[PDB]
Design a protein around this ligand. Structure first.
Ligand SMILES: CC(=O)N[C@@H]1[C@@H](O[C@@H]2O[C@H](C(=O)O)C[C@H](O)[C@H]2O)[C@@H](OS(=O)(=O)O)[C@@H](CO)O[C@H]1O
Length: 481
């Protein structure tokens, strides 16, 4: 062990052996610089936790580095921060930076920490290039973030102009049972989670059972920038953005719920770039969609194949349900005007979504909304394949023959989908079952010791006077003088 000051904490962690347990006494640990270099062992991790979670706060000009392996950080509350604004950057290490593999951060609270730009948690490469793998971030709460960059960055490469066929190695991390709710920042200010950087990177990370409630940081709720990542059973409630397959082919999104249940803002949504994806059993019910992106539930990116804005084609869209979406259920050519100019400027060949396998999807609408189910300005007969879908409530918008018989609707059986190496999920079995369960609630994800939801944005879409002030200062110093 029990430590009650920063200095004794520093000492014990330098001495702790595998299987060790370091418990932090109730109190505030201000300007704490926790650097854990020792390592635990498989089956004998080193645990650093609050003796009484909820009573230990890491504050001030703080920082945590998990450099060894088999380490666990649990039950810590990060608040009242004061890191130097001229010392931290977006794309740099997070407040908590994980540099070693097999590490876990669980049941921790990050609430409007400070004004220094950075992610709250990151897996970062050491100076010699080694990439952290097999880490887990779970049951953590991330609220009222007023700084730039994502809440979480999972890195397997360093930032560089890029595009050398080379790509970062698979990471195999897992992000589950976390809560994300943060205020809207201007422009491409960093969203909820980023995984990887370019299409040649391999991710193989599992993001499941997370609750994003008014995760409004920016247009991207999650910007998945690496191959073979699996998003399963996540709930996105009233989020001003979309969950994206931004870079990297062969990504999976199964049984996620995208719900917009009021008229306060435009909600999303999934925006898809790239090919060979598996989008199945997702439930979309959006009371309002995003005007800037085209007003739809699912956006399929038009553009140049395998480019910076990779064309969306050759993928499986099965057993999804689009219920009373106030916008198009599927937009087949969003932002086509900009994309066509982008391709022209870069001497690329502009193309539009095709080779799409749409199977067993349900499209339904019975509310006074004005949008037909689909928008495809570049429709070509037979470019896509439609089987076992059901549509009724409004015009389809495109010349496609679809059953209107709801009573006969049934999800289809899929059995030719290969699982993702490193992720223990039977994709065929999950897809074939159809949509299971329902939206996740706070009690299903919150830290075991935390009863009430931190912050104010999730429930009020407003920040306190003190926090709104800091947020404005952050935004202002990052904009033209
Ligand atoms: C350089 C680049 O293409 N970045 C894209 C980003 O696009 C920029 O930002 C916007 C916008 O937020 O509306 C429009 C212009 O395309 C460009 O200045 C954006 O892509 S988008 O075109 O789909 O919007 C984001 C995803 O939201 O992805 C970045 O890579």
């Amino acid at each position: 062990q029990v430590v009650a000051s920063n200095e004794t904490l520093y000492q014990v962690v330098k001495e702790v052996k595998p299987g060790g347990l370091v418990q932090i006494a109730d109190g505030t640990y201000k300007d704490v610089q926790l650097i854990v270099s020792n390592s635990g062992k498989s089956g004998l991790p080193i645990t650093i936790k609050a003796l009484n979670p909820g009573k230990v706060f890491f504050t001030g000009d703080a920082k945590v580095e998990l450099r060894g392996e088999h380490l666990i950080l649990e039950g810590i509350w990060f608040k009242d921060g004061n890191r130097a604004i001229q010392a931290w950057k977006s794309h740099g290490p997070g407040l908590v930076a994980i540099y070693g593999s097999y590490n876990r951060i669980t049941a921790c609270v990050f609430d409007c920490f400070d004004e220094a730009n950075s992610a709250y948690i990151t897996t970062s490469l050491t100076e010699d290039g080694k990439v952290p793998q097999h880490c887990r971030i779970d049951h953590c709460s991330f609220t009222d973030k007023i700084t730039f960059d994502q809440v979480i960055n999972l890195n397997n490469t360093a930032r560089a102009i890029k595009d050398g066929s080379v790509g970062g190695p698979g990471m195999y991390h897992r992000v589950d049972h976390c809560f994300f709710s943060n205020p809207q920042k201007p422009g491409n200010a960093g969203g909820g989670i980023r995984i990887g950087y370019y299409r040649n990177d391999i991710g193989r990370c599992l993001v499941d059972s997370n609750l994003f409630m008014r995760q409004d940081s920016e247009a991207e709720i999650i910007t998945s920038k690496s191959q073979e990542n699996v998003y399963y059973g996540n709930t996105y409630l009233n989020c001003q953005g979309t969950m994206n397959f931004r870079h990297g082919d062969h990504q999976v999104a199964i049984n996620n719920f995208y719900i917009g249940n009021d008229q306060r803002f435009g909600y999303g949504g999934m925006f898809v770039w790239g090919s060979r994806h598996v989008i199945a059993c997702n439930y979309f019910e959006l009371s309002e969609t995003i005007k800037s992106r085209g007003n739809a539930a699912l956006y399929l990116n038009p553009g140049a194949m395998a480019s910076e804005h990779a064309l969306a084609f050759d993928m499986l869209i099965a057993n999804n349900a689009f219920i009373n979406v106030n916008g198009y259920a599927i937009h087949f050519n969003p932002l086509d005007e900009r994309r066509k100019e982008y391709c022209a400027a870069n001497r690329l060949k502009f193309e539009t979504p095709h080779q799409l396998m749409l199977k067993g999807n349900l499209f339904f609408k019975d509310k006074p909304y004005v949008y037909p189910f689909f928008k495809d300005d570049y429709f070509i007969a037979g470019k896509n394949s439609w089987t076992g879908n059901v549509a009724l409530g409004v015009e389809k918008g495109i010349p496609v023959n679809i059953s209107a018989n709801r009573s006969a609707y049934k999800p289809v059986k899929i059995k030719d989908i290969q699982p993702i190496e490193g992720i223990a999920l039977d994709l065929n079995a999950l897809i074939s079952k159809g949509i299971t369960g329902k939206p996740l609630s706070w009690d299903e994800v919150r830290p075991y010791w935390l009863k009430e939801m931190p912050g104010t944005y999730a429930l009020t879409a407003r920040l306190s006077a003190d926090r709104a002030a800091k947020f404005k200062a952050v935004i202002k110093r990052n904009k033209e003088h």
